[PDB]
């Protein structure tokens, strides 16, 4: 560990190397909301029935002998999927004479280059999976390049509900907005069963969370309370539990049957634009909170699993009409011992069968 | 405003608004616990409330909620903030008819105080 | 001095009813054996972090 500075005939000291690694967020992927649905075909269909027809019975006259009736309805839809083809190559020109960073006179080896390239490929491939999961939770599966692949609200003939919490105004009633959010998910599920409406996930950003906990009603509801929960939420850390991959504990808030979780995930495309995970396409103004609410696995049961991701096979011999996999990795050797080639495929698309449940919450007035 | 001069809150706020109408301004959000006696039936104020000469208070929200209400019915705010928002209303031309304190139970940090406003 | 007496923390700890009623008692943390001039150094607990003077 002794080499030169600006003269080849003098020696200096090489203390070591310090590395910075980009942040990687995996909260939504680790939530386990989307159940894997491996597939053999490149597209799938679904039936959307809709009795949706209970009217009240208008009275008749016993002598006249009139009556009523009611028809039904049954429709069908289809679905495409997205394909990703990460590819990278290794040549000896990256090993010939290249010294390992952090050491004085040791050359790099093929094994470490291959390992780091493979690890980079895998992390680059799963961050986009997390991004697509968040996009599906938003209700519109949009590519990182802004290419629409599945407009759930259209494909399903529903409308997205946006709830304006109005956290800046002390006169606003947070209880009413929370109750509206809770009731919308109860009266719009339309499953034929009973809906709790309080098992919902609420994921917000810095602005929404700070404005919510700062609101005088929320603060007052806990200031005059002797429960240990009130003590922890007014004075304590408020970073209760969880791990989004960058921070050891996600910060959560309890104001009834609902839990507000602050999620701050950021990803970049190849053009440099930053894709913040918790955002609403359109509201770019700052000082406005944005959050997304969606059910968990416990709302409708293991039966109805609104959230699922379908995987499809590759266009490679041996993989025709085969159950899809999350990731396919292949290795090929260049001709005349010129190096090694790599590939990484995934034919995937997440979707939500009841997009009307996915609602957005905002911290500004209507 | 000398300490314990008014035997209740109702007669305290009657001459608090009158003092404000006369050009006197008050600010006690930093030492709030030292000037508000507990319970609205106790003599007001607990300690003498000093005057101020640099009252420059611009709130972040519309203080006159309606044309006849300082806050929406049921709004909870810091007690010291109520007096500032009330002072903001008299300065801008709103007159106070009745200050809602009949069934209130808390005076310390957060209280549900309201005022019925009028023009001129 | 400005932080401990700020109205947002002052009333929050005033309504607090935990053994941390050290809003009246000593903020010398009974901790901080250093500063080589003061056996105990001022210390404040809030928001999950600890402020040290």
TrEMBL record, chain B:
Residues of the full protein shown: 2 to 121 of 372
Keywords, alphabetical: Repeat
Protein name (Swiss-Prot/TrEMBL): Putative tail protein
Organism: Shigella phage Sf14
UniProtKB/TrEMBL annotation, chain C:
Superkingdom of origin organism: Viruses
Protein name: Major capsid protein
The organism of origin for this protein: Shigella phage Sf14
Entire-sequence positions represented here: 211 to 263 of 367
